[PDB]
């Protein structure tokens, strides 16, 4: 890579020439005044990117010791900072993270001011590091053959690509690994019993409880292991944040006003729910009427209708959620990303689980009681849609995930072109992959009693998807900068909610389908709503009781890295304490020493 | 008090004379070898108590600096220990707590070995401090007149009687204070509307949610204020603990074996539930048949039956719970007390809320459908039992709390008799008073839609009960030793569970009684169990949604003491850091300084 850390794509297309060269000179002054060596090279037809390297080894050592000092002070490291003359960077992640903080974190603390495209420049499109292609191809061809990734492999996806990708890859490993028990139980139940089986439903809800509690425990242990536990204290501030007052330099904003702006989440959620429910239910009723009332060239209208109407409405809701998320201030980038993710999860929940719920609950149980207003319903509609969403939708999702973007794409002559064709790749966001895994866990927690080969299909697809996501990161994207994290984000409570409703939906399914597969064949006159709500009541409360039992069991087992990170915070204070910090009386005149008190005791006992 | 800190009642009644004097000499040796001045005086007819004072001011200063060092090291204090020559004890609580640690915490760390009555002595009945009667009477007559206790008053009940009593008194103050909104709303609803009113039920569930979340916030703030946040790390070990192995000196026990012994909680809970349910339901059916089927001298059998059969069964269940709580090891005293409290809360729940539930749910809705097997039921049975349990049971509880134990009870001549008549008082346990307040909150959260003057009665009784509990502590008991805590214990999650079921029970009540007070008059043929379970379903899920909203709102508002205790843990580390700890290169040979890079930039832009 010729020691090049970062590439800063300065643009000059839409900006006139003297303003562009003034912006360029002010960009290159703050890079030399922060300790970074710059080398400008010709970019695209209308761009000009500047390479960035730490200027000297002593400047890099002084800049990486003052980045270990800061997160030791803010309670992340819990052990003393190594001295600066012996403080070499541990890996590529620490070096690239220090260089990115020197580039982006503003001039109040000591870094440069470069915020990409937002506030003063509006020209620097991206600040991307370069790939380590030999190590990437070695890791790809090394663990394209192993059945399970080791902790050394997870530490290599920590040392490259940072910790925010390493937490996702450890989550995917600990999710493919824990899929083996419901995979074996689902194969056993689909071979032995039929679908809608009670022991498979209880086993599946117990497995979701156990997996969620074990991954909360493993997240705490892994954030203690990777020295990134309290990384919320050193989160990167943002320049879009507009403060009210200034109390000494941080620019505070009253959090109650942000709560009152956060209460717009409920009308946005109601609008998104009503609009997406109207579109999906209208498409579903159109498909039902056209396909089973009134043809082979006329069955294809509602599928093209959702394929050309759902992503447009979802992009409109994404725009409205972004415009509302800029209204609330959110001084850090992590709070903004978590708020945007919690906003789009409602759209993702409705878009992902509304067809299976109308077909499973509104379609199978009523249908005839409706169709005359517009029956001998198709009994395999629910099984066919679960089979579709689990197998064929995952096949086409893997297709449009990694095959379609691959088909879509002197001495420095090869390097200046490999950076140029790495400049056009896609910026990698790990929330999309966490979204895919969480929607998949939602399918497995909600509609697994229909067709219990769903965990088997998810096991095979997860083993393919781990390697495919690593191939996408190393090949089809720019390198993500080493972002740190402690959890996977709001996806933890998303997974808890997903399983939470799964405990209601699967129990309602195994109640109302315990008469066959056709379940409540059309018109519902048999289903007894006094027996449909009692099983939901008792199953949800047994779910909550067993979940409380498992969380109270797993809380009392301290993991080794947490038990080693609450001991070093005693050892550091013990080392601090050794390095520095160096009438009435006539009642007590009778018995002086402890021998005469024993004499009065023996004299009073005898 | 003539500077006397503690009184250690050595017994010699059942022990023969040479063994008693050997135990006495070994008791008095370890007191002089730990730094405490002893003065033995004649006790009761068959006891002999030894007074204990710190021997010298320098020894007390060295013993109180090494007790600030320890909880600074274990992460409780978060600020540097003051030097020992200027480390005077802050109040009576710190001095008496240091003297109690020197008396009781065993010889591995530096204290003496005196465990009361357990392991080697089996004679020292109690180690009680002496009352500060002038300050106690001054505080009693000072805040027997004020409407609300100030934070200085709460800090005085912290400085005397420690922090475990101060947390309860702050809880009772913050519970009497937050009773004013449901008191005013219940008076407004009982004057304007009738009983079983929907807006009063929604307001009451919202008030329970808000009060529980605010008291969790205030508990965190108060444990940060009183410098006792992480006091779980310095909990007092116990001598009943029997360890498996010894790894360097703590005596570890495998926690999975304690989990497997903790799984006996479910058969004990089933046994207690079935037995107490059988006794209470048999008494209730006997009372119903005798009082309303078949007399004035014959109505009094079932009341004497519970008054002579419920406390005997509860004492049997207390004995079984103690024998099971000694089976599980529980190395600390706080874990043992929390486990015993969580065991007796099931007995307290069933004994406290089973008559109102059978009368409200089993009696009002069926009754005739039952009585022929043994109707025009009495409509005011539920209102009369709620009125009884809220008003008259609280009056007789205040009576048997403080009036009956008061009627039941040379130069050193007055002092040796005031200690002698303080030796016979009752050892004060704050879990009984927290149990009374939590059972009262359970009544208010479960059965307030019946007769909505229940929060008004609870407001008056709580203002009386705060002063009466302080009178009981200062007058009718020995002084409790200054035990530290951070929460009130498991009563927090007890209160959450209490309100949790209240959201089901009150909604079922206001469904099935929205036809009058008689509700489902006898035989149930009107109540529609498809409408009884939908309101329970929707009300419980709206309860959980609003509770999640309130906890997510109150989590984002940092209290001032927590925001000052996460800043001093930056300041201490910042003070530590200042007191101590002092081919490839041909690509980077084109442009040396940032001026020539700007020259290449202008040459490439132009
Ligand atoms: C059946 C509804 C489940 C109701 C529920 O449990 O709500 C909260 C779950 O919080 C959660 O994880 C929810 C996390 C956010 C998920 C919200 C998605 C809305 C989808 C709308 C379509 C309770 O929270 P808590 O504190 O009791 O645990
Ligand atoms: C639990 C208590 C549930 C009590 C249910 C009582 C009602 C009941 O009988 O349910 C039967 C099965 O129940 C059911 O699958 C109940 C399914 C329970 C699933 C619980 C999942 C979470 C448990 C997590 C625990 C982890 C450990 C349905 O069959 P059944 O012929 O009568 O209908 C024929 C006709 O009415 C349908 O057209
Ligand atoms: C209606 C039943 C309520 C079921 C329930 O919410 O159980 C747990 C509550 O934990 C609790 O506070 C329970 C604390 C212990 C109270 C148990 C009393 C049993 C009374 C038996 C008579 C869930 O726990 P979590 O983590 O979801 O919050
Ligand atoms: C909520 C959705 C509830 C839907 C309930 C639907 C069923 C219903 O109609 O309930 C009515 C009142 O409901 C009710 O009190 C519902 C009571 C809801 C109480 C919710 C408490 C927790 C909410 C915490 C939120 C805090 C903010 C009862 O009257 P009604 O004449 O029909 O019966 C006459 C005859 O059937 C009785 O013999
Ligand atoms: Ca996929
Ligand atoms: Ca993926
Ligand atoms: Ca009382
Ligand atoms: Ca009391």
Author numbering:
A (entry chain B), B (entry chain A): 13 to 260, 267 to 312, 317 to 396, 419 to 453, 488 to 660, 701 to 724
Paper excerpt:
The 3.5 Å resolution structure of afTMEM16 in the larger MSP2N2 nanodiscs in C22/Ca2+ shows an open permeation pathway in all 3D reconstructions, with Cα r.m.s.d. ~0.5 Å to C18/Ca2+ and ~0.4 Å to C22/Ca2+MSP1E3. Thus, in afTMEM16 an open groove is not sufficient to enable lipid scrambling and nanodisc size does not influence the conformation. In the C22/Ca2+ maps we resolved several lipids near the dimer interface corresponding to D2, D3, D6, and D7 (in MSP1E3 map) and to D2 and D6 (in MSP2N2 map) seen in the C18/Ca2+ map. Reconstituting afTMEM16 in membranes formed from lipids with longer acyl chains dramatically inhibits scrambling although the groove remains open.
